[PDB]
Amino acid sequence: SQMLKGVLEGCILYIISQEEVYGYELSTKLNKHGFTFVSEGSIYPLLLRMQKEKLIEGTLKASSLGPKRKYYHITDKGLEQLEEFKQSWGMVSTTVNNLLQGE
Amino acid sequence: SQMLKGVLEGCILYIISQEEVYGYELSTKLNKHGFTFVSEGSIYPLLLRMQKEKLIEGTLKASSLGPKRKYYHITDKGLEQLEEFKQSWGMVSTTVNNLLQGE
């Protein structure tokens, strides 16, 4: 699971870029897309840091059901970095995947 | 190129596991499989460390052409770790690649 953490910040940015989500909603999506080890508790410090670096930002909005939650959205800086991640990832993915099938 | 370094040790183990190679031969293969930034100079400290951790081992063998070179081969410990890398990689690769194609 040591490597899952390398790409976790990028996948969090991707998810948030596509939909405003609150903490529990985020980790649930992460779980169901294959990050089985993540929990709100384990990624919390990463969320605090991504905020301090202004990649994402939480705002208190009312939910479709009424109760007010802290939804996170991506900043312009965060989007720039998301694009960097997508580019790097497709590069490394292609490079490593082609290699490991040589025989 | 910050992420290319995460998986570089594993790809080096893969390559060495498949063929005994000397330093220049190794970096050439790395270049031609898409690690365009690597050079003998840049990966040297990583090779020294992989040796100190007993993942790979160099031995002075004679080349098909005669001159003696320092060829590297993988240790049992190195092979174990290579299998760990292959498992982790296929997991993360699948997880990230499926995610980044949601829309």
Numbering used by the authors:
A (entry chain A), B (entry chain A): 3 to 105
Provide the publication's sentences verbatim:
Unlike LmrR, but like the other PadR-s2 proteins with known structure, the bcPadR1 and bcPadR2 dimers have a completely closed dimer interface. The closed dimer conformation and inaccessibility of the conserved tryptophan residues of the bcPadR proteins are incompatible with a drug-binding mechanism as observed in LmrR.
The gene encoding bcPadR1 (locus BC4206 in B. cereus ATCC 14579) is located immediately downstream from BC4207, encoding a putative membrane protein of unknown function. Transcriptome analysis revealed that BC4206 and BC4207 are co-upregulated in response to enterocin AS-48, indicating that these genes indeed form a bicistronic transcriptional unit. Overexpression results in an increased sensitivity against AS-48 (MIC value of 1.0 µg/ml compared to a MIC value of 2.5 µg/ml for the wild-type strain, p-value<0.005, >6 cultures as determined with Student's t-test) suggesting that bcPadR1 acts as a repressor of the BC4206-BC4207 transcriptional unit, when AS-48 is not present in the medium. Electrophoretic mobility shift assays further reveal that purified bcPadR1 specifically binds to the intergenic region between BC4205 and the BC4206-BC4207 operon. BcPadR1 was crystallized in space group P41212, with one protein molecule per asymmetric unit and a solvent content of 71%. As these interactions are crucial for the strong DNA binding affinity of RTP, it is likely that the conserved residues in bcPadR1 and bcPadR2 have a similar DNA binding role. This is corroborated by the observation of a bound sulfate anion in the bcPadR1 structure, which forms interactions with the highly conserved residues Gly25, Tyr26, Glu42 Arg71, and Lys72, likely mimicking the interactions with a phosphate moiety of the DNA backbone.
